[PDB]
Amino acid sequence: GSHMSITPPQIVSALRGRGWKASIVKASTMSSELKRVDPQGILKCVDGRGSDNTQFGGPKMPGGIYAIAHNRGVTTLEGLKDITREVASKGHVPSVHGDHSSDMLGCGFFKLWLTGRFDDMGYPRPEFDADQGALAVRAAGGVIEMHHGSHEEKVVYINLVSGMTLEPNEHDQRFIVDGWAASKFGLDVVKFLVAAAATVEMLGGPKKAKIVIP
């Protein structure tokens, strides 16, 4: 794994510097919501909408496992399958998702990645489309989740409490980003967080974040 080379205060700084409203929240005040990660839960997208998921308690990352492929510059189906098997071996059920309105293009993160919206940040675009990616994840043993309804996120949670997560609430929506999970998968954490912040921004999400720490 890789370590957390950026402090919560710096994260807050960075965000406010991109025009965000941000602050640090102590895990003890969210005691009732922070859930110990359940290994049978799918590692899924930050998306705040309801879905047909029945595998709760997994880590939250942009586009599900796509965040990992994205951060590492992995752009092929074979590489994506390797990541799917890697995730499953490291304690989480790998997933990606789509929705009813746009099918497999229903994951805003992937659509941004596929459409070159990360070009400016120097990211190699995927070399496959949303349909091919979803099917490759499934074929490699992962899950394809399906959301519904519209995006109504009121805030962004950047959870830095390792081994814990927050769950979606379709009636009082929020984006959830498990930053510690990036360390677990040895990702460039700073890059992972900037990418997550950018995703909210480009999707016109709320630029209000709460950084959760022990």
Secondary structure letter of residue 79 according to DSSP: H
Site string for Zn ion, 15-54 (x = CB under 5 A): ------------------------------x-x-------
Q: Does 145 bind Zn ion (CB under 5 A)?
A: no
Q: Torsion angle of alpha carbons 107, 13, 6, 96, nearest 10°?
A: 0
Secondary structure letter of residue 24 according to DSSP: E
Q: What is the largest CA-CA distance in the chain?
A: 43
Q: Which of residues 90-119 bind Zn ion (CB under 5 A)?
A: 107, 109
Q: How far is the CB of 1 from Zn ion (least distance, A)?
A: 24
The span from the CA of 39 to the CA of 91, in Å, is: 5
Query: Is the Cβ of residue 12 or residue 197 nearer to Zn ion in the bound state?
Result: 197
Query: Is the Cβ of residue 12 or residue 107 nearer to Zn ion in the bound state?
Result: 107
Query: Is the Cβ of residue 77 or residue 99 nearer to Zn ion in the bound state?
Result: 99
> What is the enclosing helix (H) or strand (E) of 159?
strand 156-159
Annotated binding site for Zn(2+): 45, 97, 107
